[PDB]
Design a protein around this ligand. Sequence first.
Ligand SMILES: CC[C@H](CO)Nc1nc(NCc2ccccc2)c2ncn(C(C)C)c2n1
Ligand SMILES: O=C(O)c1cc([N+](=O)[O-])ccc1NCCc1c[nH]c2ccccc12
Length: 274
Amino acid sequence: ENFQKVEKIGEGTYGVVYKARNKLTGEVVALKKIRTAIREISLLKELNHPNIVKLLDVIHTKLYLVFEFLHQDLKKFMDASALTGIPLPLIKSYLFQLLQGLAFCHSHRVLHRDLKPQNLLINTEGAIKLADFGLARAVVTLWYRAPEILLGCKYYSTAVDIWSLGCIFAEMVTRRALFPGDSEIDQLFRIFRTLGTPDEVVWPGVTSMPDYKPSFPKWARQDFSKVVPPLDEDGRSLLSQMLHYDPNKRISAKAALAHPFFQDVTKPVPHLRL
Ligand SMILES: CC[C@H](CO)Nc1nc(NCc2ccccc2)c2ncn(C(C)C)c2n1
Ligand SMILES: O=C(O)c1cc([N+](=O)[O-])ccc1NCCc1c[nH]c2ccccc12
């Protein structure tokens, strides 16, 4: 064995993840054990960005992915910060960095598809990185799933990642999940009860979606002032554009980076207890 497993650090959406040390290198890494796709996965090795976890190596026998190791994830950090809240400048820095990562991978036609706080990794320097990409084909948490996925769209787009990141943004601010559904229909109806049941006016073609039913209850939209109360008007405007129902009207990552909310963005350092 080339890798001394330091500690099982959990279970990703596609396999088991270990903290490990290379015996003849000393390098400390994260090992994801899993289970054509070999070709596409391998390409990810030399597409690098500061806000994307580095893929170091791909090993086939059962499939192994060797990643750089980060010491905390955002769910843990959110939980550790729940009595006080994450300071707004750090929320804003993290959101800005995550949109840079998404803009990079979307510009290379790579989607994540399963963003959640557990797959956002942070370090002591104030960086945050996207991990646990849903790139295998290319109980489960539904809380961050975009409505077009839930309505059965087969060919959903980079917009699904903006939706997920919007839900995470809201959760950092309010310290409660925005849409904590426990079934696909509960997830959909939680979205509808907050943003209003979508119709052809705000989402042309929605009533043609594979899983759309005319029998869906018709809930009125609530106001974002009620949804993420603390957040200022710049923040609420950006969030509203990240949660547009119509994937074609939803803001892109590149466009979100230009939003006035980020005019005063900085890079604070988190207080991490490791
Ligand atoms: C905690 C859930 C998260 C799944 O994405 N696991 C995780 N967690 C990582 N670090 C956070 C952590 C450290 C120690 C114990 C538990 C979690 C981590 N670092 C690199 N990677 C690669 C596989 C993407 C990591 N993956
Ligand atoms: O994140 C994961 O855990 C993951 C899982 C699988 N998988 O399950 O087959 C495959 C790849 C994964 N990450 C790649 C990260 C990555 C490096 N450079 C990039 C450039 C653009 C887009 C993404 C990346």
